[PDB]
Structures are given as C-alpha cells and as structure tokens.
Design an enzyme around this catalytic site. Sequence first.
Site: not given
Length: 722
Positions: A253, A290, A349
Amino acid sequence: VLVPNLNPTPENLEVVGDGFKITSSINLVGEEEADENAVNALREFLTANNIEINSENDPNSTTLIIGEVDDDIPELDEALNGTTAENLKEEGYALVSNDGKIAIEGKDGDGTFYGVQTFKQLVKESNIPEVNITDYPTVSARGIVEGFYGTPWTHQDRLDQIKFYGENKLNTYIYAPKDDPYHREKWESEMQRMQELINASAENKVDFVFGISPGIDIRFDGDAGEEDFNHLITKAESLYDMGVRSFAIYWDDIQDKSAAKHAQVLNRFNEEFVKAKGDVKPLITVPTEYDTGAMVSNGQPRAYTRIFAETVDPSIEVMWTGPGVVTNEIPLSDAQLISGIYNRNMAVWWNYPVTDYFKGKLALGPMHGLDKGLNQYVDFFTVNPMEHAELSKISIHTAADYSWNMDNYDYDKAWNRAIDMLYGDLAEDMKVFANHSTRMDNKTWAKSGREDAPELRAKMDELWNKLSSKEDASALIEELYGEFARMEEACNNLKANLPEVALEECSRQLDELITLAQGDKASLDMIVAQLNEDTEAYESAKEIAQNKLNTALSSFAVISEKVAQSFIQEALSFDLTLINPRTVKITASSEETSGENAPASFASDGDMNTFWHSKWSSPAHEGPHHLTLELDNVYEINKVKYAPRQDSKNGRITGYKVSVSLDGENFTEVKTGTLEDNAAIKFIEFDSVDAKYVRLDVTDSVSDQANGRGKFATAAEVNVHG
Ligand SMILES: [Ca+2]
Ligand SMILES: [Ca+2]
Ligand SMILES: [Ca+2]
C-alpha cells in the site's frame, strides 16, 4: 507393505521389493561428514519412535547411511547400486532402501535434509517399504508470505509453522506484516522473539526473509532524504548480525505513486547491501501494482509499471499475484505477459487461503486454478495464509506438492493427502467439513479456489431437474437425506475431538455447517410434503427451514454459500408445480420484430420484464390473437398464469379462451372467461387435465390507441402449472 501417503510426491519412485521391518536398535553411518541439521531431525525421529543408535558396528541390526556427494563414503555408494545424486539439481535427494540397508544421498546440505523427511513418511510403525527414489524440486524458492490484515500470528504459532514447512519440503518464510514495533511504524527487549525464528529456520533449511513496509510515511526528497536512506540498511544490518540472510522492501500500500522513487530505493539498496556483503540472498520486492488488471491496460503496461520495470535491477526478485489480487486462475498466457514486461523469472504472491478480505469463511482447499507449467516463467513460489494458523496447514500441504512436483500435480488427490496426514483417524470427518469450505468469493472483486462440494451440487441440480419433469426422485431424495445427516454427524464428532489449536479457529464454522445441514433436511421435508399434499407438515417444515437460513445469514460464520446455504433458498423459491419451461416452443398468431424486438419467444422466457407484442407495424395483424405453448412432454395442468405487460396497457388480455391438445392440430377447450383490466398477474384456474399443447385464444384486449381496442395482444409471461 505398500507406499504410504507422501508429501511432496517424488519425481521418480518404483517398487523394487516387498518391504522389511526395522530393528529396535540400529547403527547410523556418516554423522560427522553429513549435514549437521539433516541428522538432528533424524536423531529425534528415532527417539520418538523408540529407536536407539549402536555405539559399535553390528551386522545383526539395520544400517541407515546418510551423507552428501561431496563426502567420500565407500559404504554409502555401495548401498546405492547404480544410483547417484550428482545428475540431480540443487535441493535434490536420492533414497534407496533394499534388504535392511537404507541409503540417502543429497546433492548439497539442503538436498540431504529433504531425504530425511521422505524416510520419516515411509516409516509406519517400523515398517519401511523397499523402493528406489531419485528426486528434485521444480521450483527453487518455495514457501509462505505472512501478509494478512487483522490479528497477527503468535510466537508459538510461528515456531510450529517453521517445523511444518521443513517436513513437507519448503525453504522460504517471509516476515511481516503486521503491526510489529519495527517493520512499518518505527522502521535486547525484543531480540529473542526474532532470534528464535531464525535459528529454527536454519535447522529446517528455510531461508528466513525479513520484510519492510515503509510506504505510508517514507520520504524521497531532501537530506534525509538521504538520512532515511542511510537509516534503512542499518535496520537490516542488525538482523544480518542476528542471522537473517534475506531481506525485502514492500510497496503493497503506498499512495505516493512514483516508480522512479521506489526503484531508486531498491536499486541502491541492491548495491549497498546484497552485493556489498556477499553473504546476502537476492533482494525481494512487491510493486504498488501487483495484479495484472491494475498492472496492464490493455495491454502493454500502465504508466507506473513501465517506469518501475525499466528501472529496477534484473537481479532483484519481483512478486505479483496474478490476473487479479485474489483471482481464480493463473494461466500461462498471463505469466508470459508479466514476465515479458520485466524480462525475468517473476515471483508469485498467491492469495490463498488468506481470508483477510472475507473473514467469515475459512479456506481449506488445495492449490486450484494454477497452470501446471507455471515453473517455466516462475521460480519463486509463496502463499498468503489465513490468520488462523493451524488450519492454514491444509492448503500449505497442497502448496508443497504443487511447487515441488508440478507436472504430476493433482489438486483433488493432493487435497485428500493433506487431510489424511494432518488428522489421522479423524481425517474422513474433517474432509466432509473442509469439502464445504474451499471456494472463496466475496461476490465482488475477490474469488479463487476449488468449488465447494461439487458432487453434492450436481445431485442438488439433479433434484430440481427431476422434480420439474414428473420424474420420481425417491432414490435421489433418500441419498440427499443421508448426505445432509453425514454432514451433521461429521461436524459433531469433530467438535468433541479437536485439539483446541484447531477447534477455536473453526468452532463457529462447525456450528454453521450443522445449521445449514439441518436446514437442508427441512428443505427436503417440504418437497416430500408437496408430493404427499400434506400442507400442515409443509408449513411446519417451512417454519423450520426458513429459521435455519435466517439464523445462518445472521451468524458471523460463513460456509458453503453456493451449495449448502443456497439449497435452502432454492427450496423456498421453488413453485413447482410449474414446469416452467423453458421449454418449450411458444408460437403465436402474429409477433413484432421490425418495430420493436418483442417476438413470441419472450412470452415463456421466464424474464418478467420482457414481453411479446402482436404485429403492430405496417402491415399490422389485428387479431384474432392467440398464444400456443408447446410442452416438453405431456403434462397434467390445472392453472395458467398470465402476467400482463407491466409498463403499458397496450394489448392487455381482458378476455380469454384456453384450450388443450395432444397432437397440436386438434384443440379442445377447458375454460372461457374475462380478466379485470390492470397490471396484476392473473391466475386462470380450471380442472386438472393432461396436455401437450396449451392454447390461449384472446377474445378481448384493450389499449391506449383511440380505436385500438382488440387490435393488439401483449403478454409479459404466459405459462402453465400443475
Ligand atoms: Ca558435507
Ligand atoms: Ca453466515
Ligand atoms: Ca417474458
């Protein structure tokens, strides 16, 4: 003896012999030259299973030989017989058990450790089978990424997880978040807590990675400015003295969306730390964008990713979640897109089982949706776990089999192996509970994982099909009653026997599935009550079934929305008595297509908004108008529902003449009457009668067209009931 349930599945395995029993006391060979951490795990395993090691050599006992390729042991290579570890890649092993001799050879220190964990899984009450194994991982860096919002893991949860990774062959663990006093915030009194994690990670051959999340209040311009930058490295250097060989800086963030400023921090840190020490593992980072949707548009990449990818050093590792943040699949095509932009092997991820977006539901499914050729563009795998640490083991278990042996991976079987191993005798009951809690979906931006209880869903659909087609479902209904009882039986026995570590995390979810199961039982009661015409019991069961859903929708726990919860709601919205389409072949006297798209198809469409209109465009067909519904199969019917055009008065049927037929050419009659002029849905009711064609002859209709009475005929919905 046969081969037990292994995890991960070795690349090559063959049954050479039958099996032999292990002696109470054995003699180990190659302790001093072998990996120190690899033997420590083996020594305590022998202590736990009541096995001792001989001081002197003994020909009567079994011999367990262990070492490396680097080591020159003539006893080990002889016990191998045509088997080597030199032809294998890093972190690989070669196990061979034959005639009271078990040899294990790893390529390096890491490889030999994983040879020990296979031996522990093969041994079942001192009965190891005789098989030859040559094995190696498909992904180099496999592990977990602790990055979930809410209450962080405790120290005892973390230590337990470290040991769990090593046994199932995983070599990575990322710290952070969350609100540690040092990671984000202020990035001896709290030395031990971090120190105990690193030492245990070294013992289980896992590379401990330290995370850093400075985005919210980091500065780029100014002195300090450099001062913050100088005060970056020293934070990491303290952990380098504590034993941390891997570090990472996160942008998950940030807001202050400047790729040139983020890369500046990473690239100069890559020069002043990881290359400057020579000790350190490559740098890991997560950009602000991402997910592929946020990364590219559409697509060649957005403004942020273009600057970021072209600035960051090729040596640095970069993590990305997939097509979305929490997405269903990661196709190879998506992997080609992202890796093409960075021109390197990307890190992943994977946001499963993480439940930080949807805290109510648990995630106990396998690695679902990931392409089996993901090793091509990815050589770094990590998963985001739940805040519930004990239950996160089930999905992590499946992560080990996927990452290690990808080309032979099967998600359904790997899921069954996760629950069989972690629970033992109490596995089958846990499987039933976990089966209903796999599909994650917040009905919006997040969705992933395997569908919940599919077999049960197909059967549920099979029930509505056979109910809406005259067919007898007694055999299917009997199986459903039993299936919902199996749910309540498994959930209770789990509650009476689970270790708190597990029970406290899923106590509300066990009570939830039971409430749904009881509701599913009460749902079938209504269906039985409709077939038996017992309206008193119907309403009595309806009384229960409605409450269970109300208490389920009010209760915090969420589980099996699509299957167990929705089955209750469907039983409430089922007419039927309808049959109902759709199904079939509505036809008419005249229909409109030119002026407006409102053909006869929309008469039995199901959609209440759509309507049929008679041909009003020139040359207009001014009646007599009629609808003729073809039935799929002959049906007994005693009610014809008429839903008039809601928005307009034009062509409301205020006089009808319903007929039936079995051939389609010769119609008869059943009821003739009128209808009050309004937008209300009319129910035309007559005596039960078999029919394959339902006709609706319009004898009167109205409109706001001056002299347009009986010129038009409009029907939003027309369908029969019985
Ligand atoms: Ca060695
Ligand atoms: Ca709920
Ligand atoms: Ca319609």
